[PDB]
Design a protein around this nucleic acid. Structure first.
Ligand SMILES: [Zn+2]
Length: 271
DNA sequence: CTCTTTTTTCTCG
DNA sequence: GCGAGAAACAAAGA
Protein backbone atom coordinates (compact mmCIF):
# COMPACT_ATOMS: atom_id res chain seq x y z
CA UNK A 1 0.00 0.00 0.00
CA UNK A 2 0.85 3.69 0.07
CA UNK A 3 1.74 5.79 3.14
CA UNK A 4 -1.85 6.09 4.45
CA UNK A 5 -2.40 2.32 4.38
CA UNK A 6 0.99 1.58 5.93
CA UNK A 7 0.36 4.16 8.67
CA UNK A 8 -3.02 2.52 9.33
CA UNK A 9 -1.38 -0.88 9.76
CA UNK A 10 1.30 0.72 11.95
CA UNK A 11 -1.32 2.18 14.29
CA UNK A 12 -3.20 -1.10 14.64
CA UNK A 13 0.01 -3.02 15.33
CA UNK A 14 1.15 -0.42 17.88
CA UNK A 15 -2.16 -0.78 19.68
CA UNK A 16 -2.12 -4.58 19.69
CA UNK A 17 1.35 -6.18 19.69
CA UNK A 18 3.54 -3.74 21.61
CA UNK A 19 4.67 -5.55 24.75
CA UNK A 20 4.29 -9.01 23.21
CA UNK A 21 7.09 -11.53 23.56
CA UNK A 22 7.86 -13.37 20.32
CA UNK A 23 7.55 -17.07 21.15
CA UNK A 24 8.59 -18.38 17.74
CA UNK A 25 8.89 -17.35 14.10
CA UNK A 26 8.16 -19.63 11.14
CA UNK A 27 8.43 -19.20 7.38
CA UNK A 28 7.09 -20.99 4.32
CA UNK A 29 8.79 -18.40 2.12
CA UNK A 30 12.10 -17.61 3.89
CA UNK A 31 13.56 -15.92 0.80
CA UNK A 32 11.61 -12.69 1.43
CA UNK A 33 13.79 -11.99 4.48
CA UNK A 34 16.61 -10.22 2.65
CA UNK A 35 18.98 -10.42 5.62
CA UNK A 36 18.53 -14.18 6.07
CA UNK A 37 15.59 -15.95 7.70
CA UNK A 38 17.42 -18.35 10.01
CA UNK A 39 19.49 -15.44 11.25
CA UNK A 40 16.37 -13.37 11.93
CA UNK A 41 14.67 -16.29 13.66
CA UNK A 42 17.70 -16.82 15.90
CA UNK A 43 18.00 -13.13 16.80
CA UNK A 44 14.33 -12.28 17.43
CA UNK A 45 12.87 -15.36 19.11
CA UNK A 46 12.23 -14.61 22.77
CA UNK A 47 12.46 -10.85 22.23
CA UNK A 48 9.71 -8.34 23.03
CA UNK A 49 8.14 -5.83 20.64
CA UNK A 50 8.78 -2.34 22.01
CA UNK A 51 7.07 -0.32 19.28
CA UNK A 52 6.22 0.15 15.61
CA UNK A 53 7.40 3.12 13.54
CA UNK A 54 7.13 4.09 9.88
CA UNK A 55 9.23 5.98 7.35
CA UNK A 56 7.63 6.58 3.97
CA UNK A 57 5.92 3.31 2.98
CA UNK A 58 8.25 1.32 5.26
CA UNK A 59 7.10 -0.33 8.49
CA UNK A 60 9.69 -0.47 11.28
CA UNK A 61 9.24 -3.03 14.07
CA UNK A 62 11.25 -2.09 17.16
CA UNK A 63 12.15 -5.38 18.83
CA UNK A 64 14.43 -5.66 21.82
CA UNK A 65 16.49 -2.55 22.44
CA UNK A 66 18.80 -2.93 19.45
CA UNK A 67 16.79 -4.61 16.67
CA UNK A 68 14.73 -3.04 13.91
CA UNK A 69 12.74 -5.17 11.47
CA UNK A 70 12.10 -3.13 8.32
CA UNK A 71 9.10 -4.38 6.38
CA UNK A 72 7.80 -3.24 3.01
CA UNK A 73 4.41 -4.45 1.76
CA UNK A 74 5.09 -3.46 -1.85
CA UNK A 75 1.99 -4.10 -4.00
CA UNK A 76 -0.09 -6.70 -2.13
CA UNK A 77 1.46 -7.39 1.26
CA UNK A 78 -1.03 -7.86 4.08
CA UNK A 79 -0.73 -8.47 7.81
CA UNK A 80 -3.33 -10.08 10.04
CA UNK A 81 -3.53 -11.03 13.69
CA UNK A 82 -4.91 -14.54 14.10
CA UNK A 83 -5.49 -17.29 16.65
CA UNK A 84 -2.69 -19.80 17.16
CA UNK A 85 -4.87 -22.52 15.63
CA UNK A 86 -5.80 -20.46 12.56
CA UNK A 87 -5.61 -22.51 9.35
CA UNK A 88 -2.94 -21.69 6.78
CA UNK A 89 -3.98 -19.60 3.80
CA UNK A 90 -2.40 -20.09 0.37
CA UNK A 91 -0.30 -16.93 0.29
CA UNK A 92 0.81 -16.74 3.93
CA UNK A 93 4.62 -16.56 4.04
CA UNK A 94 5.75 -15.66 7.55
CA UNK A 95 4.39 -15.74 11.07
CA UNK A 96 5.45 -14.22 14.35
CA UNK A 97 3.87 -16.31 17.10
CA UNK A 98 2.94 -14.86 20.47
CA UNK A 99 1.44 -16.52 23.56
CA UNK A 100 -2.18 -15.72 22.64
CA UNK A 101 -2.07 -15.19 18.89
CA UNK A 102 0.13 -14.71 15.84
CA UNK A 103 0.99 -12.01 13.31
CA UNK A 104 0.87 -13.46 9.79
CA UNK A 105 2.32 -11.86 6.66
CA UNK A 106 0.74 -12.77 3.32
CA UNK A 107 1.67 -11.51 -0.15
CA UNK A 108 0.23 -13.01 -3.33
CA UNK A 109 2.91 -11.55 -5.61
CA UNK A 110 5.77 -12.23 -3.17
CA UNK A 111 7.15 -8.69 -3.61
CA UNK A 112 7.16 -7.76 0.08
CA UNK A 113 10.41 -7.76 2.04
CA UNK A 114 11.79 -8.09 5.57
CA UNK A 115 15.21 -6.81 6.66
CA UNK A 116 16.71 -7.07 10.13
CA UNK A 117 19.11 -4.27 11.05
CA UNK A 118 20.36 -2.55 14.20
CA UNK A 119 18.92 0.56 15.78
CA UNK A 120 21.83 2.77 14.71
CA UNK A 121 21.63 1.50 11.12
CA UNK A 122 18.07 2.77 10.53
CA UNK A 123 18.86 6.39 9.66
CA UNK A 124 21.73 5.32 7.34
CA UNK A 125 19.42 2.73 5.75
CA UNK A 126 16.93 5.39 4.67
CA UNK A 127 19.64 7.86 3.69
CA UNK A 128 20.93 5.17 1.32
CA UNK A 129 17.39 4.72 -0.06
CA UNK A 130 17.32 8.47 -0.75
CA UNK A 131 13.82 8.71 0.74
CA UNK A 132 12.49 12.28 0.80
CA UNK A 133 10.71 14.11 3.66
CA UNK A 134 7.56 12.88 5.40
CA UNK A 135 4.39 14.59 4.07
CA UNK A 136 3.83 16.99 6.98
CA UNK A 137 3.98 20.77 7.27
CA UNK A 138 6.86 20.30 9.70
CA UNK A 139 9.07 18.10 7.49
CA UNK A 140 7.98 18.90 3.91
CA UNK A 141 9.71 22.20 3.09
CA UNK A 142 8.03 23.92 0.14
CA UNK A 143 11.14 25.97 -0.67
CA UNK A 144 13.39 22.98 -1.37
CA UNK A 145 10.45 21.28 -3.09
CA UNK A 146 10.12 24.27 -5.42
CA UNK A 147 13.83 24.40 -6.20
CA UNK A 148 13.98 20.73 -7.16
CA UNK A 149 10.93 21.08 -9.41
CA UNK A 150 12.43 24.15 -11.09
CA UNK A 151 15.66 22.31 -11.91
CA UNK A 152 14.01 19.30 -13.55
CA UNK A 153 12.49 18.40 -16.91
CA UNK A 154 10.94 15.20 -15.53
CA UNK A 155 7.18 14.76 -15.74
CA UNK A 156 5.49 15.55 -12.43
CA UNK A 157 3.73 12.21 -11.84
CA UNK A 158 6.84 10.03 -12.33
CA UNK A 159 8.96 12.45 -10.31
CA UNK A 160 6.51 12.40 -7.37
CA UNK A 161 6.43 8.59 -7.49
CA UNK A 162 10.22 8.51 -6.97
CA UNK A 163 9.80 9.12 -3.20
CA UNK A 164 12.64 11.67 -3.42
CA UNK A 165 10.68 14.95 -3.43
CA UNK A 166 8.44 13.70 -0.63
CA UNK A 167 7.79 10.22 0.74
CA UNK A 168 4.57 8.23 0.65
CA UNK A 169 2.81 8.82 -2.68
CA UNK A 170 1.81 5.80 -4.73
CA UNK A 171 -0.35 5.44 -7.83
CA UNK A 172 -3.65 6.16 -6.09
CA UNK A 173 -2.68 9.27 -4.14
CA UNK A 174 -0.44 10.75 -6.83
CA UNK A 175 -3.48 10.71 -9.15
CA UNK A 176 -5.73 12.17 -6.44
CA UNK A 177 -3.17 14.86 -5.55
CA UNK A 178 -2.61 16.01 -9.12
CA UNK A 179 -6.37 16.24 -9.70
CA UNK A 180 -6.80 18.25 -6.51
CA UNK A 181 -3.97 20.59 -7.52
CA UNK A 182 -5.27 20.80 -11.12
CA UNK A 183 -1.98 19.64 -12.66
CA UNK A 184 -1.68 17.30 -15.65
CA UNK A 185 0.45 14.20 -14.86
CA UNK A 186 2.71 14.71 -17.88
CA UNK A 187 3.54 18.33 -17.05
CA UNK A 188 7.31 18.93 -16.95
CA UNK A 189 8.07 20.18 -13.44
CA UNK A 190 10.13 23.18 -14.58
CA UNK A 191 6.96 24.53 -16.18
CA UNK A 192 5.06 24.74 -12.88
CA UNK A 193 4.62 28.28 -11.56
CA UNK A 194 4.99 29.18 -7.87
CA UNK A 195 1.25 29.26 -7.10
CA UNK A 196 0.74 25.82 -8.64
CA UNK A 197 3.70 24.41 -6.70
CA UNK A 198 2.22 25.89 -3.54
CA UNK A 199 -1.16 24.26 -4.20
CA UNK A 200 0.55 20.98 -5.02
CA UNK A 201 2.60 21.11 -1.81
CA UNK A 202 -0.45 21.67 0.39
CA UNK A 203 -2.54 19.14 -1.54
CA UNK A 204 0.04 16.39 -1.01
CA UNK A 205 -0.09 17.02 2.75
CA UNK A 206 -3.88 17.39 2.89
CA UNK A 207 -4.73 14.30 0.82
CA UNK A 208 -2.39 12.00 2.74
CA UNK A 209 -3.43 13.29 6.16
CA UNK A 210 -7.08 12.87 5.16
CA UNK A 211 -6.39 9.34 3.92
CA UNK A 212 -4.70 8.52 7.23
CA UNK A 213 -7.65 9.90 9.18
CA UNK A 214 -10.00 7.65 7.17
CA UNK A 215 -7.93 4.51 7.65
CA UNK A 216 -6.59 4.37 4.11
CA UNK A 217 -8.16 3.10 0.90
CA UNK A 218 -9.49 -0.45 0.88
CA UNK A 219 -10.74 -1.10 -2.64
CA UNK A 220 -10.78 -4.73 -1.57
CA UNK A 221 -11.05 -5.50 2.13
CA UNK A 222 -10.69 -8.78 3.99
CA UNK A 223 -9.67 -10.23 7.33
CA UNK A 224 -6.47 -8.21 7.64
CA UNK A 225 -5.10 -5.17 9.46
CA UNK A 226 -6.10 -1.85 7.93
CA UNK A 227 -8.90 -3.34 5.85
CA UNK A 228 -11.68 -1.14 7.26
CA UNK A 229 -10.53 2.02 5.47
CA UNK A 230 -13.03 4.53 4.10
CA UNK A 231 -10.80 6.71 1.92
CA UNK A 232 -11.80 4.75 -1.19
CA UNK A 233 -15.20 6.44 -0.90
CA UNK A 234 -13.45 9.81 -1.25
CA UNK A 235 -11.44 9.10 -4.41
CA UNK A 236 -12.10 11.64 -7.15
CA UNK A 237 -10.26 10.09 -10.09
CA UNK A 238 -8.38 6.87 -9.35
CA UNK A 239 -10.32 4.02 -10.93
CA UNK A 240 -13.06 6.46 -11.97
CA UNK A 241 -12.49 6.12 -15.72
CA UNK A 242 -15.64 7.10 -17.61
CA UNK A 243 -17.26 8.74 -14.59
CA UNK A 244 -17.91 12.48 -14.28
CA UNK A 245 -15.48 14.87 -12.59
CA UNK A 246 -17.04 16.24 -9.39
CA UNK A 247 -15.85 19.77 -10.19
CA UNK A 248 -16.58 20.39 -13.87
CA UNK A 249 -18.52 17.35 -15.02
CA UNK A 250 -16.17 16.14 -17.76
CA UNK A 251 -15.50 12.40 -18.03
CA UNK A 252 -12.45 11.13 -16.18
CA UNK A 253 -9.96 9.66 -18.65
CA UNK A 254 -7.27 7.02 -18.16
CA UNK A 255 -3.91 6.97 -19.94
CA UNK A 256 -0.47 5.43 -19.48
CA UNK A 257 2.34 7.57 -18.08
CA UNK A 258 5.79 6.05 -17.61
CA UNK A 259 4.15 2.63 -17.51
CA UNK A 260 1.56 3.46 -14.86
CA UNK A 261 -2.22 3.63 -15.14
CA UNK A 262 -3.12 7.31 -14.86
CA UNK A 263 -6.54 8.84 -14.15
CA UNK A 264 -7.28 12.54 -14.71
CA UNK A 265 -9.87 15.16 -15.72
CA UNK A 266 -8.91 16.66 -19.14
CA UNK A 267 -10.65 19.93 -18.23
CA UNK A 268 -9.38 20.53 -14.70
CA UNK A 269 -5.89 19.26 -15.56
CA UNK A 270 -4.85 21.10 -18.73
CA UNK A 271 -1.92 19.52 -20.56
C1' DC B 1 -3.78 -19.98 -25.16
C1' DT B 2 -2.15 -14.63 -25.65
C1' DC B 3 -2.01 -10.05 -23.86
C1' DT B 4 -2.99 -6.65 -20.23
C1' DT B 5 -3.41 -4.86 -15.59
C1' DT B 6 -2.24 -4.29 -10.60
C1' DT B 7 6.39 -0.88 -5.52
C1' DT B 8 10.99 -0.76 -6.05
C1' DT B 9 15.18 -1.22 -8.67
C1' DC B 10 18.04 -2.80 -12.34
C1' DT B 11 19.63 -3.21 -17.47
C1' DC B 12 20.26 -1.15 -21.81
C1' DG B 13 21.69 2.41 -25.10
C1' DG C 1 23.27 10.43 -14.89
C1' DC C 2 18.59 9.81 -17.87
C1' DG C 3 14.27 7.67 -20.20
C1' DA C 4 12.15 3.37 -21.62
C1' DG C 5 11.10 -1.08 -20.63
C1' DA C 6 11.12 -4.78 -17.80
C1' DA C 7 11.73 -8.02 -13.88
C1' DA C 8 10.31 -10.16 -9.25
C1' DC C 9 5.38 -12.99 -9.14
C1' DA C 10 0.31 -14.35 -9.06
C1' DA C 11 -4.27 -14.06 -10.57
C1' DA C 12 -8.16 -12.49 -13.09
C1' DG C 13 -10.41 -10.35 -17.17
C1' DA C 14 -10.68 -9.41 -22.29
ZN1 LIG D 1 -12.88 18.40 -14.01
Amino acid sequence: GELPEVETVRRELEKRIVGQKIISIEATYPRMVLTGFEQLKKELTGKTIQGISRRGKYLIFEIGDDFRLISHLRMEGKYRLATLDAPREKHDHLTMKFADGQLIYADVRKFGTWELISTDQVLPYFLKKKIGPEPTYEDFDEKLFREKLRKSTKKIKPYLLEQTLVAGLGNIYVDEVLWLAKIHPEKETNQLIESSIHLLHDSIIEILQKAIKLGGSSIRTYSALGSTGKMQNELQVYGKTGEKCSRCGAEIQKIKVAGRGTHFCPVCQQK
